[PDB]
A paper describes a structure:
Programmed cell death-ligand 1 (PD-L1), also known as B7 homolog 1 or CD274 belongs to the B7 family of immunoregulatory ligands, and is widely expressed by lymphoid and nonlymphoid tissues, as well as various tumors. PD-L1 expressed by tumor cells plays a critical role in the induction of inhibitory signals through the interaction with programmed cell death-1 (PD-1) expressed on the cell surface of T cells. This PD-1/PD-L1 interaction results in the suppression of tumor-specific T cell responses functioning as a tumor immune evasion mechanism. Here, we report a mechanism for small-molecule inhibition of the PD-1/PD-L1 axis with potential clinical benefit in oncology and chronic viral infections.
Compound A was co-crystallized with hPD-L1 in a dimeric form and the obtained crystals diffracted to the 2.49 Å resolution. Crystallography studies revealed that compound A can indeed bind PD-L1, but through a hydrophobic pocket, which is created between two PD-L1 molecules thereby stabilizing a PD-L1 homodimer. This compound A-induced dimer interface includes the residues needed to interact with PD-1 protein, thereby resulting in potent PD-1/PD-L1 HTRF. Compound A interacts with both protein subunits, burying 276.0 Å2 of chain A and 271.0 Å2 of chain B. Both left-hand side (LHS) and right-hand side (RHS; ethylamino) ethanol form hydrogen bonding interaction with Asp122 of chain A and chain B, respectively. The LHS and RHS pyridine rings form π–π stacking interactions with Tyr56. The LHS amide linker carboxylate makes water-mediated hydrogen bond interactions to Gln66 of chain A and a similar interaction was observed on RHS to chain B. The central benzyls bind between Ala121 side chain of one chain and Met115 side chain of the other chain. These aryls also form van der Waals interactions with Asp122, Tyr123, Ile54, and Ser117. The two linked central benzyls are rotated by −106° with respect to each other at chain A:B interface.
Residue numbers in the entry:
A (entry chain A): 18 to 138
B (entry chain B): 18 to 136
The structure:
C-alpha cells in the first residue's frame, strides 16, 4: 500500500551537465523526519543516506563527494530528488531510491550518459 | 549504522529440495513489531512482504504461492529466515532481504540450483 513511483525510469543526460532524478512517496500533513529513511545508491555505491533527518558524509562514496545532494525542500511534496552535478560517463547505470516511511518501497532508475559530441548541421 | 548481515551469500541447492536463506539484523529486548518491515524478493518478484506483523498473501508472486514462508519464531533472535519448499530450476538467481527496524539495510544472496543428476 506504501508505494514509491517514478515519473520516468530512464534519464538520458549530456556529459558534464546537472541531472535531478525523482522518487515520489505519499506524505500527508507533518513530514515525520524521525520516521523517514531515504537511500540512493548506484550498484552498491552509497550516494545519499538520509536517516531520520541526519546525513553522515563520511559514508558517501568518494566518486559522489561534492556532486550529489538530496533536495530536502522537495520532501514535503513527497519528492526524494537526487541532484548530481557535472555528470560523468561512469554515472551511467542503475540507481535505486529506497524509502522507509510508514511502509517501505523502492524503484530502479536507469541513467544513460551520452558521449560528449560536437553536433553540427 | 543499522546493519543487516548474511552468514552465507551463496547457497547451492538440489532440485526439488527445501532451502532456508538467512538475514541477521540487530534486535535488543522486545522486538517492536509495529516498527519492523521484512521484504524478500528475487528479480522483482515479491516473495515475502512482512509489514508491521501483517502479510498479504495476495501480493505474493504466483511462482512462490504455498512454497515460501518467513519463519517468524526466528525474528525475536534477529533472524529473517526465508524457507522455500520444492526448489525449482527458476529459483536460481539473486535474492534480496530488505529490513527496516530503526534503521534500514539490505543484503544480496545468490542461489544456484543443481540440475537433477543420478549417482
Ligand atoms: C533497504 C531499505 C533502505 N536501505 C538503506 O537505507 C540502505 C543503506 C545502506 C545500505 C548499504 N549498506 C551495506 C552494509 O550492509 C543499504 N541500504 C532504505 C529505505 C528502505 C529500505 C527498505 C527496507 C525494508 C523493505 C524495503 N522494501 C520493501 O518492503 C518492498 C516491498 C515491496 C516492493 C515492491 N513494490 C513495487 C511497487 O512499487 C519493494 N520493496 C525497503 C526498500
Amino acid at each position: 500500500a506504501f508505494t514509491v513511483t517514478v515519473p520516468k525510469d530512464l534519464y538520458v543526460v549530456e556529459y558534464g551537465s546537472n541531472m535531478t532524478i525523482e522518487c515520489k512517496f505519499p506524505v500527508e500533513k507533518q513530514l515525520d523526519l524521525a520516521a523517514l529513511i531515504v537511500y540512493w545508491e548506484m550498484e552498491d555505491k552509497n550516494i545519499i543516506q538520509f536517516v531520520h533527518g541526519e546525513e553522515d558524509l563520511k559514508v558517501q562514496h568518494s566518486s559522489y563527494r561534492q556532486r550529489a545532494r538530496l533536495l530536502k525542500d522537495q520532501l514535503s511534496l513527497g519528492n526524494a530528488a537526487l541532484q548530481i552535478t557535472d555528470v560523468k560517463l561512469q554515472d551511467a547505470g542503475v540507481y535505486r531510491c529506497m524509502i522507509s516511511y510508514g511502509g517501505a518501497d523502492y524503484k530502479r532508475i536507469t541513467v544513460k550518459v551520452n558521449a560528449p559530441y560536437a553536433a553540427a548541421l
